[PDB]
Amino acid sequence: GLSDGEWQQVLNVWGKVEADIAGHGQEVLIRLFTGHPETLEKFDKFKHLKTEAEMKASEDLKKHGTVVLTALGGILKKKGHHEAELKPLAQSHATKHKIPIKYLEFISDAIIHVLHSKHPGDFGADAQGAMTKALELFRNDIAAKYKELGFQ
Numbered sequence: 192g193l194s195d196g197e198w199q200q201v202l203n204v205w206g207k208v209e210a211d212i213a214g215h216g217q218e219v220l221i222r223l224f225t226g227h228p229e230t231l232e233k234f235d236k237f238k239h240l241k242t243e244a245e246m247k248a249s250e251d252l253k254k255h256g257t258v259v260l261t262a263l264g265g266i267l268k269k270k271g272h273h274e275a276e277l278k279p280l281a282q283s284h285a286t287k288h289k290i291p292i293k294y295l296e297f298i299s300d301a302i303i304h305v306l307h308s309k310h311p312g313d314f315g316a317d318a319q320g321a322m323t324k325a326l327e328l329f330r331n332d333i334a335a336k337y338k339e340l341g342f343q
């Protein structure tokens with residue numbers, strides 16, 4: 192898993208996100224959609240977004256950004272003891288949303304991208320390392336639930 196020192200770095204980095212959760216949330220989603228357009232097709236409520244301007248101008252996209260990061264934040268604060276929080280998410284994403292684990296990889300990298308973009312020179316090597324481990328743990332535990340369900 193992660194060491195205590197690493198969890199501290201992770202939650203320290205999260206303080207940045209918490210200062211503007213909707214902003215970070217919005218940019219993470221836009222980065223995901225613009226970098227991987229197929230991901231947009233998984234959202235029946237965002238498919239109408241034809242341009243990045245429309246994306247940036249969407250209040251509902253900002254709203255979902257808050258929903259997504261708030262959920263991730265609650266999970267990170269469990270520092271690994273997130274079975275109860277993670278299971279239901281893995282199941283709705285595999286069964287209801289049909290989100291391949293590949294997309295969870297995309298969003299993880301998108302989070303790292305947004306942190307550097309919004310905080311250049313203030314997201315150190317040790318910080319990127321700890322946050323990456325956390326996102327991998329999150330991703331890996333979801334992958335386990337996916338195998339359980341036989342979802343691809």
Ligand code: HEM
Pocket residue numbers: 230231233234235236258259260262263279280283284288290294295298
């Ligand atoms: C950091 C990773 C992610 C977190 C924490 C997260 C969290 C959430 C939460 C809490 C909801 C609402 C409740 C639910 O339906 O379970 C949701 C809905 C949804 N998510 Fe995720 N999500 C993540 C990644 C993804 C990715 C990578 C995609 C697709 C590219 C995706 C697609 C969707 C869709 C389609 C919905 C339903 C939207 C709607 O119709 O309202 N999610 N997500």
